Every structure is written in C-alpha cells, then in structure tokens.
Design a binder for this molecule. Structure first.
Ligand code: ANP
Ligand code: MG
Length: 285
C-alpha cells in the first residue's frame, strides 16, 4: 500500500528515501530543465563501491519552502515503489545545498520525443514490449493504491535497452484524462486505464499528439459524444481494440491493468496475432 505524504516535522522523504553522501555523486552534463531547477546526468558510487549512471535533479538556489516541499514530495512518492517499470529513486541529498534527487539514468529520455525521432522504425513486437513494461509498472502502482493522474508518453522514460518506466510523480492534462475525471474529478485506477489507452495510441503513432491541436472544449465534447482517436497507421486490430476497451465510457467496463498486461503478453507469445491490421471516429455503443 501507498501512503500519501499528507504533518511531519520536516521530512517524510527519509521514510522512503536514502540520504546520499554527496562525495559519492559526480555531475556530467545538463540534460533537461524542471519546475524546480536543472536535471543533469552523472554517476553514483554505491556503498558496495559499484558505480552507476544516474539522473540528478537539483533544487534552484533561493527556493521557497513550498518549492522544497513539492520537490522532495515527488521523492517521497517515488521511493515507495520498487519495480522494474517504475523509475528507481537512488536517494536524496538534503543535508547540503543544493538539495538533490537522484534517480536511475534513462539514456533515451522521454518516450514521446524518442519515438518522434524514429517514426516507423521499430517492429510491432518492439512497440508491444514498451507497452507491456508501462502496463506492468501501472499494475504495481494501482496495486499500491496510487492513482497517477498524469500518465502520458511524455511522463514515461526509456533506457538504452528500450525498457520503459513510469515517471512524474507530482489540474488538468485534458487529452489524457478520462471523461468522468474531467466531468467531476472522479480519479480512480480506471481513469489511469483510460490514460493508458491514450499512451497506447501515442506509442503506436510514434509520438503524435493525442487529439492534435483540437480546442480543449472540443476534445471534451467529442469524447463525451462517443468519438475516439482513429487507428494509427498500420495498427494491429488487437491493439486498436485494446485502446477502445481502455476508452469505454463506463469505467467499470475498462480492463484492469493486470488484464492489460495479460493481453499484451499473449500478443508477445503469438506475434502472428499482430499481423491482422485495422478525424475522430464515432464508436457510441
Ligand atoms: N532518469 C532520467 N534519465 C535521463 N534523463 C532524464 C531522467 N529524468 C529526466 N530526464 C531528462 O530531463 C528532461 C526533463 O525532466 P522531467 O522529468 O520531464 O521534468 P519535468 O519537470 O517534467 N520538465 P519537462 O518534461 O521538460 O516539462 C526529460 O525530458 C529527460 O530528457
Ligand atoms: Mg516531464
């Protein structure tokens, strides 16, 4: 079971995060920018003396106490999960400044941008492998009682071996959010399943934006009317059906993450199944 960080004296992070000795951290280069400061790549020397690659996020100089709480709050969530398809927290640095969060390094970065650089260049089995990993991570998160609420290809990271891992544990990504969650903030693991369907579409579309640049009001209305994203080019029928199933109007009719993992495992085991190949499309009822 997950425990929601919220009134601890200062750190609920140390309950779920190792304090690292900064002598064990080396910084290589800046690789991104976040809400709270820079993201860099580097190396961590473990207590066993093994050295691994890591991503390092720093809290900007002159941070507000709210910024520090939000920053470290991500770590306090992430550190509750230990799963091959959820980004691994190596630890935090809080006893010296800048404050740091250290995570496993993912060489190929965010999944959406990675796929956009490789349009039509992976096999269907490679894409299904990516999707299976994401579903497996979500199965564990849902098992722990955690609703992600931001599941999107931009919040999945991918490593040198194409292994995909759920990231971003911080209103309202409209394009990724279930109709009931938009309508009245009904967030459940079934709303994450909806989001997963959108990620499935993103992956099979090589990082096309869901609903393109449609007005948000039109995304909301169109989906409510029963319209759905169309099958990506050369999309296996099995995978488009899985998207449609994730996008059922009635949240109780959507598959559970365990079922999604099972469906994808069957496609991996019987790759011939993927050879059957399938503007918004109306599929009311
Ligand atoms: N563990 C990691 N390994 C390698 N690169 C990473 C890692 N974490 C973050 N990055 C890189 O840093 C970028 C920004 O980090 P991210 O976790 O997306 O923070 P953010 O606050 O969501 N900012 P953005 O995604 O740019 O709006 C990502 O797109 C990656 O390229
Ligand atoms: Mg991000």
């Amino acid at each position: 079971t997950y425990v929601d960080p919220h009134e601890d004296p200062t750190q609920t992070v140390h309950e779920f995060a190792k304090e690292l000795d900064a002598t064990n951290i080396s910084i290589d280069k800046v690789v991104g920018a976040g809400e709270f400061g820079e993201v860099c790549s580097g190396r961590l020397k473990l207590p066993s003396k093994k050295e691994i690659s890591v991503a390092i996020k720093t809290l900007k100089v002159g941070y507000t106490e709210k910024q520090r709480r939000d920053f470290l709050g991500e770590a306090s969530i992430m550190g509750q999960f230990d799963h091959p398809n959820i980004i691994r927290l190596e630890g935090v640095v809080t006893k010296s400044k800048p404050v740091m969060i250290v995570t496993e390094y993912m060489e190929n970065g965010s999944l959406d941008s990675f796929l956009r650089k490789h349009d039509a260049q992976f096999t269907v089995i490679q894409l299904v492998g990516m999707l299976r990993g994401i579903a497996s991570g979500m199965k564990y998160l849902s098992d722990m009682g955690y609703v992600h609420r931001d599941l999107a290809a931009r919040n999945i990271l991918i490593n040198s071996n194409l292994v995909c891992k759920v990231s971003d544990f911080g209103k309202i990504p409209i394009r990724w959010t279930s109709p009931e969650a938009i309508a009245y903030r009904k967030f459940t693991s079934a709303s994450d399943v909806w989001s997963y369907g959108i990620v499935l579409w993103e992956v099979m579309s090589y990082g096309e934006r869901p609903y393109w640049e449609m007005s948000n009001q039109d995304v909301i209305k169109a989906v409510d009317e029963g319209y759905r994203l169309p099958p990506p080019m050369d999309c296996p029928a099995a995978l488009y059906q899985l998207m449609l199933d994730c996008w059922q109007k009635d949240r109780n009719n959507r598959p559970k993450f365990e079922q999604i993992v099972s469906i994808l495992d069957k496609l991996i085991r019987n790759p011939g199944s993927l050879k059957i190949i399938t503007n918004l499309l109306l599929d009311q009822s």
